[PDB]
Design a protein around this ligand. Structure first.
Ligand SMILES: [Zn+2]
Lengths: 67, 136, 101, 213, 25
RNA sequence: GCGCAAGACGGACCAGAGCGAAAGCAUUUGCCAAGAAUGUUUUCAUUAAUCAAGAACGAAAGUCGGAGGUUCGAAGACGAUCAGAUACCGUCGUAGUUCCGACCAUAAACGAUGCCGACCGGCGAUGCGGCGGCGUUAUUCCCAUGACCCGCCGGGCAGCUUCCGGGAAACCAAAGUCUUUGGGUUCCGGGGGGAGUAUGGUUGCAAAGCUGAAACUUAAAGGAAUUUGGCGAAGGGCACCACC
């Protein structure tokens, strides 16, 4: 494939709704502490508190709603 | 087999005919005149399974193949010619053309004009099916 | 029971109109009876707009649109859930729904 | 077995002095192999170029047809072949609750070239308009169509291609249409749809030479 | 039934009866 | 990608808009002929309305005879479907579909409502012709016209509301002006099956069209609407006897 992605961080701001067929993935809007102007929408599985920090592998791809 | 023009001073242009239907996708790349072409690829070229012909995956594999061919030959920039099924059948573009465009743009080539060359008719003949249509 | 004031169409002074064909099927429907959607859409919906913006030779290039209209039979329209049904007392509302986005 | 790209040239295309931008890109052809002629293989190549790619920062929803005729070695020369309109633009003209006026003519210039021009028209919704419809009577549409046809069969035959396509660049024929039609019914959007080239005489090299320069 | 195919079957019966009548001549 | 040829159709403009007795009618232009509405201090002076017999037109399919047959596609052929499909589905495909003639006169030909005349509400709109009335425009002056605004008249397709009134109720500005029952006039129905059937006449090369019974059997067959219902209908909520 020959594709290399840099390590990306995150910072949650406000909680949102929950997606998934059984409600296991939770929407949350984030900010990047590396560059405090870009905000993307992602899904997180697991408990999330506001004021926490998330780890990623890439921050260039967004996810759909269901399918 | 190469572009004698310097890449920093100027960039060269070809066109591509992204034809996407509900069961196939084509990526066909030629120059501005369009008489002769660079290379061609279908939706079944990279996937042996027929069920996977109409998908983003065959489109992005086709886009990567023409991306490598245009990188090795020396064509840097491409114009866009999107195409639906056309005629009297369907005026809606397929769900693989956008992924093909994303894969062809994310690989580091310059874009040009984006124009739809869908063959819109004035009035064609009768559509396939019956009076009651393709009911199921 | 007379269900509607009109008869599912706008044929009030002609008697015969021209038939057209659907998109999901090929069912012949009269023109004033069918439910038609003049959809407006762009080339890139929401994903690669920044990709097109950065990788363009033309600076601040405006993205073109695509213009298309679709024809629906009633069964194909309700099967695609474009239009739904309500109460007969609220059936007498000719106003389109308020488009927010 | 072997790549055909070894037997491949790289020629250039040039616009005449009628345009502003000279070159637009590259073309591909093989060398001659006896019964195959490299000069013939560059003949029937129609091009699809935009107006902003041939001029400065003007309107960019117009397309021009350029056909090649002759080569001399590592470069080629083109000529005017027709006009086109962007389907985004043309599909953005047509909206509901206004009437369409469309005309055509078969008009011949001073030389042997013959053109078939088209026009399209869309009417004014007025500044003080309350009424939704704003249609036009059929005799009014008929005499506006006659006015457009007589204007575009007035403009063309008085000159040759070298200046009438110069008039055809910014808005000038459509300017004459939109300026000479406020009397019958006010109209707001008129351009030229297409120019379809119909007949060409015997090819001489001199006319192609004097346009290029 | 629906009256269309009942009428079609009745017309087929009429044609059969007329065939037997013209054969019985 | 460039040229050539064939036939079909006139998308987008295309509308609760128009015309026609109805079926029906859409590229541009030219020719012939016809027509409603409008305007009128023109003309004749009761020439009128509905109408058995008789007569014209008439969707699609169908038949006879030529030309043409691009596409579509009854009959039929081939694979998958389901327990079974000579059905749905896909590839082909005869006759038709197109034009010129010659025929039957059949549709949910429906506004499921025959025509003429008169009377009794409101409101905002649209199409046609005529008439006025601040104002803007084809540049300015300036009149006449086209365009726009504000009112009116007459006819037409329509729309919203209504304790006028009516109806079994859906609903109706007509399905109203009906026990307080009578403006004029053509067709048509007496419980449901048998049956639009047998027979006879009629028209047609033919498919069939019009006219149209009886025996026997039956106590229900029907129309409107409320209440729970049953949805492989849409739209919300809940439960570890539903799940991640
Ligand atoms: Zn449909």
């Amino acid at each position: 494939t020959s594709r290399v992605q840099p390590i990306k961080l995150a910072r949650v701001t406000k909680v949102l709704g929950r997606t998934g067929s059984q409600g296991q993935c939770t929407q949350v809007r984030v900010e990047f502490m590396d560059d405090t102007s870009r905000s993307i929408i992602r899904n997180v599985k697991g408990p999330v508190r506001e004021g926490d920090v998330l780890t990623l592998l890439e921050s260039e791809r967004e996810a759909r709603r269901l399918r | 087999s190469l572009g004698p023009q310097v890449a920093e001073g100027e960039n060269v242009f070809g066109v591509c005919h992204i034809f996407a239907s509900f069961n196939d996708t084509f990526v066909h790349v030629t120059d501005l005149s369009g008489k002769e072409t660079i290379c061609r690829v279908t939706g079944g070229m990279k996937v042996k399974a027929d069920r996977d012909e109409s998908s983003p995956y065959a489109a992005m594999l086709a886009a990567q193949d023409v991306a490598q061919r245009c990188k090795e030959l020396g064509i840097t920039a491409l114009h866009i010619k999107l195409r639906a099924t056309g005629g009297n059948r369907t005026k809606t573009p397929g769900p693989g053309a956008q992924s093909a465009l994303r894969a062809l743009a994310r690989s580091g080539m310059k874009i040009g004009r984006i124009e739809d060359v869908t063959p819109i008719p004035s009035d064609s003949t009768r559509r396939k099916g019956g009076r009651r249509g393709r009911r199921l | 029971t007379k269900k509607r004031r009109n008869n599912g169409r706008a044929k009030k002074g002609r008697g015969h109109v021209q038939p057209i064909r659907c998109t999901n099927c090929a069912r012949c429907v009269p023109k004033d009876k069918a439910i038609k959607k003049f959809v407006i859409r762009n080339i890139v919906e929401a994903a690669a707009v920044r990709d097109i913006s950065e990788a363009s030779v033309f600076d601040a290039y405006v993205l073109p649109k695509l213009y298309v209209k679709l024809h629906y039979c009633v069964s194909c329209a309700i099967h695609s859930k474009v239009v739904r049904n309500r109460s007969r007392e609220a059936r007498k509302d000719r106003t389109p729904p308020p488009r927010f986005r | 077995v072997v790549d055909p790209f070894s037997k491949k040239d790289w020629y250039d295309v040039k616009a005449p002095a009628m345009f502003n931008i000279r070159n637009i890109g590259k073309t591909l052809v093989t060398r001659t192999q006896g019964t195959k002629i490299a000069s013939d293989g560059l003949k029937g190549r129609v091009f699809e170029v935009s107006l902003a790619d041939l001029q400065n920062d003007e309107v960019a929803f117009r397309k021009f047809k350029l056909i090649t005729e002759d080569v001399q070695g590592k470069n080629c020369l083109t000529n005017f072949h027709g006009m086109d309109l962007t389907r985004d633009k043309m599909c953005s003209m047509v909206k509901k609750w206004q009437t369409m006026i469309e005309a055509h003519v078969d008009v011949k210039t001073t030389d042997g070239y013959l053109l078939r021009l088209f026009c399209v028209g869309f009417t004014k919704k007025r500044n003080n308009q309350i009424r939704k419809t704003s249609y036009a009577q059929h005799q009014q549409v008929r005499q506006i169509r006659k006015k457009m046809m007589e204007i575009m069969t007035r403009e063309v035959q008085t000159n040759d291609l070298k200046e009438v396509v110069n008039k055809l660049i910014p808005d000038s024929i459509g300017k004459d249409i939109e300026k000479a039609c406020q009397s019958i019914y006010p109209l707001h959007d008129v351009f030229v749809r297409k120019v379809k080239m119909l007949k060409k005489p015997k090819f001489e090299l001199g006319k192609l030479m004097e346009l290029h320069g | 039934m629906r009256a269309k195919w009942r009428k079609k079957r009745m017309r087929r019966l009429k044609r059969k009866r007329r065939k037997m009548r013209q054969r019985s001549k």
